[PDB]
Amino acid sequence: GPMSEKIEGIIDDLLNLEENAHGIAIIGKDGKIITQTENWNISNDLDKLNEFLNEKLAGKKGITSLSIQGIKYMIVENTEERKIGTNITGKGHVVICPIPIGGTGALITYVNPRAGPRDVLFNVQEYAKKLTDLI
Amino acid sequence: TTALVCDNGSGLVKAGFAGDDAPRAVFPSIVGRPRHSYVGDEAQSKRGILTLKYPIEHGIITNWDDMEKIWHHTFYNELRVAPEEHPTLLTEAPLNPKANREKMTQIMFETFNVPAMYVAIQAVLSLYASGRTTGIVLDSGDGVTHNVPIYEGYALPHAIMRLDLAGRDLTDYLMKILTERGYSFVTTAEREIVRDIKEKLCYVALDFENEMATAASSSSLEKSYELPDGQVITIGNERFRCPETLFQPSFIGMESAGIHETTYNSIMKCDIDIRKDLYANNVMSGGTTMYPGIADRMQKEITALAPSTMKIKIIAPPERKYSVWIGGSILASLSTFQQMWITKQEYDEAGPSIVHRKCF
Numbered sequence A: 001g002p003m004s005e006k007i008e009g010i011i012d013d014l015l016n017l018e019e020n021a022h023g024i025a026i027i028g029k030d031g032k033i034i035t036q037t038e039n040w041n042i043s044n045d046l047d048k049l050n051e052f053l054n055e056k057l058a059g060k061k062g063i064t065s066l067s068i069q070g071i072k073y074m075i076v077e078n079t080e081e082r083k084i085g086t087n088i089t090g091k092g093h094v095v096i097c098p099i100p101i102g103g104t105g106a107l108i109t110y111v112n113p114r115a116g117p118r119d120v121l122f123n124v125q126e127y128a129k130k131l132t133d134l135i
Numbered sequence B: 001t002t003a004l005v006c007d008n009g010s011g012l013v014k015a016g017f018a019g020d021d022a023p024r025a026v027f028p029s030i031v032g033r034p035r036h037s038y039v040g041d042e043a044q045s046k047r048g049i050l051t052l053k054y055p056i057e058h059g060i061i062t063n064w065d066d067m068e069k070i071w072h073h074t075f076y077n078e079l080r081v082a083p084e085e086h087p088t089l090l091t092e093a094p095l096n097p098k099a100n101r102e103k104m105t106q107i108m109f110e111t112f113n114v115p116a117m118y119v120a121i122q123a124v125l126s127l128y129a130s131g132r133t134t135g136i137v138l139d140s141g142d143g144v145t146h147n148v149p150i151y152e153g154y155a156l157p158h159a160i161m162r163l164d165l166a167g168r169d170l171t172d173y174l175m176k177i178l179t180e181r182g183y184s185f186v187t188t189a190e191r192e193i194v195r196d197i198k199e200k201l202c203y204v205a206l207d208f209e210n211e212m213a214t215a216a217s218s219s220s221l222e223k224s225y226e227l228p229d230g231q232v233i234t235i236g237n238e239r240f241r242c243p244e245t246l247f248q249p250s251f252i253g254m255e256s257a258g259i260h261e262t263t264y265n266s267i268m269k270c271d272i273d274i275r276k277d278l279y280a281n282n283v284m285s286g287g288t289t290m291y292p293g294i295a296d297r298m299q300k301e302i303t304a305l306a307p308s309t310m311k312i313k314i315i316a317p318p319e320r321k322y323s324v325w326i327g328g329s330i331l332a333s334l335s336t337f338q339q340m341w342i343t344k345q346e347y348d349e350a351g352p353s354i355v356h357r358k359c360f
């Protein structure tokens, strides 16, 4: 869906709530970028992000790492509510929260490497839910 | 001040005080109720007037009313505390159902009125007791065996393997194979005698077929054991055929791969970029990992499975019977953990589901 100032505001709010959210992107259900913060760019990694969000596990090993803007992340948590990636050399973390739950949109947060992604999950998950109907 | 650490297993409860090196109390996870409640050693003592049950089955709490009696006994009779005065760290199995972990949290705050609590995964705690946050644990107790690969404290997605073959099953098999030798071991009380035999005299063969040959062609492997009625028995190849079952679960008619292969399969569910750390940090945890020879056997089997140049290390700490508890003591005593506890306040606001937010 198109970007909106209603979406802008929810992101403004998240970024002030969660100090350690150092970057945001929103993927719509069609897998297109709705918006992202000016301090990063996920555009060239969207194919692999979408493959990951659409994945259906077979008990065959699925996707266990993903790269965004040259940083490779190990997937350490993978549920319908939240997926956590963490770079093995200290270059940061990502939290991907599907919108709706288990669905193909997502709120993605880049997390300060000095912080822990465990601490941001609650708010990023709530904020993914706020976006559900917007899109 | 001073947190409590309770590690609830299928066979044994380990309980104590955070910052101690060892559990204060270790006692059987049994509850007895009059024929037509008691807990632990007292329940066993009165077995002739009680019906005994295990409330935890294969690591998973299945009888909640009995499990409540276990916790009450732990706090009042074993540790001698008032639970409302101490943060309480509990433990759980890998893959414990959402509902189970909520119900634990509900009971601790509503029935025991604890001021704070936390639930940690058993293998994560064992790993941490060895001074690691990355590695693959083989955690094998009385009721369940798991393979748990862990990276920076996270149990890895879809890589945990659970096997319902552990120490109790091994005791039962040793009863059966001693019965094939000419002795008779059938009753519950006979099962306890056979558990003691297993603990004292069993071991894992480095090469099982080679060991079978040495048994059959000489008595150099035979040992003697005096029963409580005075009879002295002789045990030979049963000493190593009993724990061989971990490697060949077919011995008890299970279709599963052995613990060596389930280790490998677990590692193979993990990302390429972390497997070398798993192979290099294979920690063994739990009473069933106590058999002499087990680490060297596991080293051999994993080397046969793994890529030919892979560096492998099996770590089998001398204290691994209680490494889950010990990792919990260390963790709960840390200044930096003190913000991790679920508070009563947090519970009052969010209810039982607060556990999924906080214990992760």
Ligand SMILES: Nc1ncnc2c1ncn2[C@@H]1O[C@H](COP(=O)(O)OP(=O)(O)OP(=O)(O)O)[C@@H](O)[C@H]1O
Binding pocket: B008, B009, B010, B011, B012, B013, B058, B059, B140, B141, B142, B143, B144, B145, B166, B167, B168, B195, B198, B199, B200, B285, B286, B287, B288, B289, B290, B291, B321
């Ligand atoms: N030296 C030993 N050799 C072999 N087995 C042992 C030894 N010592 C203890 N065991 C076995 O370990 C088991 C108890 O281990 P532990 O306390 O780790 O299990 P638990 O936490 O009660 O069980 P689970 O982890 O399966 O829920 C018993 O089956 C016991 O016979």
Ligand SMILES: C/C1=C/C(=O)O[C@@H]2C[C@@H](CC[C@H](C)/C=C\CC1)O[C@@](O)([C@@H]1CSC(=O)N1)C2
Binding pocket: B011, B012, B028, B029, B030, B044, B142, B167, B168, B169, B171, B172, B191, B192, B195
């Ligand atoms: C010393 C001891 C060891 C143990 O591991 O105990 C636990 C708990 C115990 C409960 C029943 C037993 C009669 C009571 C006390 C024995 C506890 O069951 C076990 O012995 C069971 C039965 S045989 C076996 O290998 N595991 C394991």
Ligand SMILES: [Mg+2]
Binding pocket: B008, B009, B010, B122, B141, B286, B324
């Ligand atoms: Mg255990």
